[PDB]
Design a protein around this ligand. Sequence first.
Ligand SMILES: O=C(O)Cc1c[nH]c2ccccc12
Ligand SMILES: O=C(O)Cc1c[nH]c2ccccc12
Lengths: 104, 106
Amino acid sequence: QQSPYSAAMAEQRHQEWLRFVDLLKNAYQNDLHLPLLNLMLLPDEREALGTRVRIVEELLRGEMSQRELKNELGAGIAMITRGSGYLKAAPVELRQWLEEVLLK
Amino acid sequence: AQQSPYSAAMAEQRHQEWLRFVDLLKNAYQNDLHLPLLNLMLLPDEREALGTRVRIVEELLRGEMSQRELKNELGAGIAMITRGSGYLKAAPVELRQWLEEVLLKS
Ligand SMILES: O=C(O)Cc1c[nH]c2ccccc12
Ligand SMILES: O=C(O)Cc1c[nH]c2ccccc12
């Protein structure tokens, strides 16, 4: 069970995360998101984000086989399992929107 | 061409994929879906790293925190500070100046 120490540190990390999220929100409103994201994310991390969008899209579409996900997107079985679990755990508003925007 | 066709084709596919992510997140913010989208797209440790990198950038721009404090408070050793400082130097000055206004506002 978490202690006051661990709870304090977790809340501090949460606030730091929200500060990043808000900084990026504002960057988008001032057309500075692209250079901000180049500063805050390494190239391989940006590549991972682009690929993960594809994985999510293709999991929702349901047409690509597991072998095709691996060959085309580099997503092996464990990554598909994790990604599927993230989708299942996402709030309904996010899943509905992703279906609307990624499969349109 | 700057790159051979194999490398160029893969780079342009990655670029298109990146822009798709950027646009998706742009719209998520507008729809108040940014938090769940980022929880889907980033692992917990990756989210923590982004929170910490904001603090490193802030403290590098502020100039007050020492090298030892950067390591002991923010996990940033000498090499990481050098890398981060290099990213700031490479960024457009417009971004740097905006970061100073936002992050050092107080
Ligand atoms: O260089 C790294 O290890 C990751 C990284 C990406 N953007 C940064 C900004 C400040 C400090 C570290 C990083
Ligand atoms: O599970 C991972 O290794 C990384 C990851 C985070 N969000 C994802 C969405 C889809 C596929 C993989 C990931």
